[PDB]
Design a protein around this ligand. Structure first.
Ligand SMILES: *C(=O)N1C[C@H](NOS(=O)(=O)O)CC[C@H]1C(N)=O
Ligand SMILES: NC(=O)[C@@H]1CC[C@@H]2CN1C(=O)N2OS(=O)(=O)O
Length: 251
């Protein structure tokens, strides 16, 4: 049962869409259907899947696992250390996940994305959008060849966390641990990841918050996405919109 809904009051004037789906009672709530079906770069939301790839291939093993920091200077304080999987995920540390993915052969990544139906599954621009000048701080998942819609994000999240993939339960639980967020409401468990990019072609942001909500037996998989032309709209801003929607409509 697909319900078209109006969450515009929570977007406080920012252009975007939201989809919340409960796979038990098959209830899909959609705000801005056209946007929810449009494929865009996942940006840092891809760290959800990249974490599972690294765990499955043995590049990392636990939420403590390290990737061998080499001393490179970065402006984010917390990137300048041999950080663990759990801290790299929470700090959205690009060098950690770039080094992780570059230890995996392209055919393995292709087959996993194909199995997950991860959007267009297009990893052809492996090294990413090099024309932005950021060099090694780039990859196929960051405003580059790989694109996925908010609906497809929710479908992927649901397949993973309902246990319908071949990923190990141990590895799923590590991901659950590191994605948990504190929304100052103990009656719901929220998990998610932000992402931020700028679509230079269309001059619009790609700002994301993707994840899941558990509340008293029911689970909702969700994706909130802005395509606003205002460059101040970031992943963290869209997460704030997402939490307001959760608190108002899913409590
Ligand atoms: C991922 O989207 N990115 C890595 C890092 N995290 O940003 S987030 O808070 O939106 O997750 C900085 C920006 C972005 C990128 N383009 O590298
Ligand atoms: N980024 C978060 O996790 C958000 C932002 C602030 C706190 C924790 N959280 C909330 O939902 N908060 O708001 S609060 O309930 O009004 O205190």
């Amino acid at each position: 049962s697909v319900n078209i809904v109006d969450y515009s009051d929570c977007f406080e004037g920012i252009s975007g869409g939201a989809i919340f789906c409960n796979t038990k009672n098959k209830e899909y709530n959609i705000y801005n259907k056209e946007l929810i079906e449009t494929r865009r770069s996942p940006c840092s939301t891809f760290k959800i899947v990249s974490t599972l790839i690294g765990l499955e291939k043995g590049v990392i093993n636990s939420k403590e696992s390290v990737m061998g920091y080499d001393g490179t200077d970065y402006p984010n304080k917390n990137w300048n250390k041999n950080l663990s999987l759990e801290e790299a995920f929470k700090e959205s540390c690009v060098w950690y996940y770039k080094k992780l993915i570059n230890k995996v052969d392209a055919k393995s990544v292709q087959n996993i994305l194909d199995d997950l139906k991860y959007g267009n599954c297009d990893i052809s621009e492996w090294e990413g959008d090099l024309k932005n000048g950021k060099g090694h701080l780039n990859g196929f998942w960051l405003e580059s060849s790989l694109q996925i819609s908010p609906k497809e994000q929710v479908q992927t999240m649901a397949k993973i966390f309902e246990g319908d993939t071949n990923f190990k339960k141990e590895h799923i639980n590590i991901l659950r641990d590191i994605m948990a967020i504190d929304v100052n409401d103990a009656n719901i468990n929220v998990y998610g990841k932000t992402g931020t990019g700028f679509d230079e072609k269309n001059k619009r942001v790609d700002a994301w918050f993707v994840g899941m909500l558990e509340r008293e037996g029911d689970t909702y998989y969700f994706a909130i996405k802005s395509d606003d032309s205002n460059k101040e709209i970031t992943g963290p801003k869209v997460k704030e919109i997402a939490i307001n929607i959760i608190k108002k409509y899913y409590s």
